[PDB]
């Protein structure tokens, strides 16, 4: 098995910690959802290739511009996250997160991931967003942002239902191998 490193970035509450917890845990957290994620080394076999994929979170480092970049050395793949219930988290992608990752991780593939896809058809979410002249992020808005920032690809998932989660990490492993 070859060792690869994955780092997830995105605004606080984009759901990055939850996504790492759900992927790494053997059984879904039905009793307690952890506040933080330390690290994990996943054994993944994708397209016949075995990889040890080390997983890291940047949660807690969003306000600290000199500590945060210490998470980037030797990263092989970046997951750049936004929440579908937060059009504001998508707006911070191109001019905040993207120039930072391109500077510290040149030539590293970025996969733009729309988290919390289950909230796109949630009535409470649609009502709260409608009060600020907003609506959940549309699939074409996510794809266009991924195209604009030079992302390797665009994917969506739901940590709550697990839908799309395995596919994101298998594709991240293929991106890291390229």
């Amino acid at each position: 098995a070859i060792r690869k490193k994955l780092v997830i970035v995105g605004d606080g509450a984009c759901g990055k910690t939850c996504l790492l917890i759900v992927f790494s845990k053997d059984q879904f957290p039905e009793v307690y959802v952890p506040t933080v994620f330390e690290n994990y080394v996943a054994d993944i076999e994708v397209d016949g290739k075995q990889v040890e994929l080390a997983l890291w979170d940047t949660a807690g480092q969003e306000d600290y511009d000199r500590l945060r970049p210490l998470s980037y050395p030797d990263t092989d793949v970046i997951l750049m996250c936004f929440s579908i219930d937060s059009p504001d988290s998508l707006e911070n992608i191109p001019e905040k997160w993207t120039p930072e990752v391109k500077h510290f991780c040149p030539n590293v593939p970025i996969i733009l991931v729309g988290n919390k896809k289950d909230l796109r058809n949630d009535e409470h979410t649609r009502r709260e967003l409608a009060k600020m002249k907003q609506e959940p992020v549309k699939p074409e808005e996510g794809r266009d942002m991924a195209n604009r920032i030079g992302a390797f690809g665009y994917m969506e998932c739901s940590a709550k239902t697990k839908d799309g989660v395995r596919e994101v990490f298998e594709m991240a492993t293929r991106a890291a191998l390229q």
């Binding site: 009793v31 307690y32 807690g60 500590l67 210490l70 050395p73 030797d74």
Partner: protein, 244 residues
Amino acid sequence: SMEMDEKDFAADSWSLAVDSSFLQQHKKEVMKQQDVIYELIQTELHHVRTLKIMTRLFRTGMLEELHLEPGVVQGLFPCVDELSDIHTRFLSQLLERRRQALCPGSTRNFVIHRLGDLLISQFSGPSAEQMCKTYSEFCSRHSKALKLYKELYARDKRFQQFIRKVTRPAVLKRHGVQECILLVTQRITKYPLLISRILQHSHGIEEERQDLTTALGLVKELLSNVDEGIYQLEKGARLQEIYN
């Protein structure tokens, strides 16, 4: 870690660690508060364990088995003895607070009602000054440590066999040299996330809500000072590159 503490923190939550007949006697709000306090202590126990892997397995093993040039081991593991002293003392205080809270006749059933004062003490005065100075030094030496590791692994056969040997056990899967360094750098930014969530479930006693609010502010002030005190050292960096 020692077996007694590993077993006390083996469960995925406080609600699964205590006896079910004890859990049943508490309101949901108390359970939510105790689950987050349990996660703070459990992750602090794991953080001290990461520091012991660095000091005892890697650092001391390199000194006792390898013929590395003087000053090379210090460059790979900057400040590890100081970091171990800070966190082992903090962990001792957290575990003593839990131990005093146990019911007579039990080694698992407890409720911690007064964490705020312990957090204010840790993140104020001389202990906060020591944490600030030590993380400013550690985090400024982080990139240099990773580069020195990569150089030694690629060029030194005995170093490569030593690393492959001591990191072979499954229990070391997440704890190679570079992984330990980033786990330590990331530890300090976990504290506000944990304290904020404990505070969210600590409104029942106003003195506790105020103490956790003061603690959260102290931790953020410490992090701001550490972040402002970092400048990455680079081996062989010239003075001209530094002053420009």
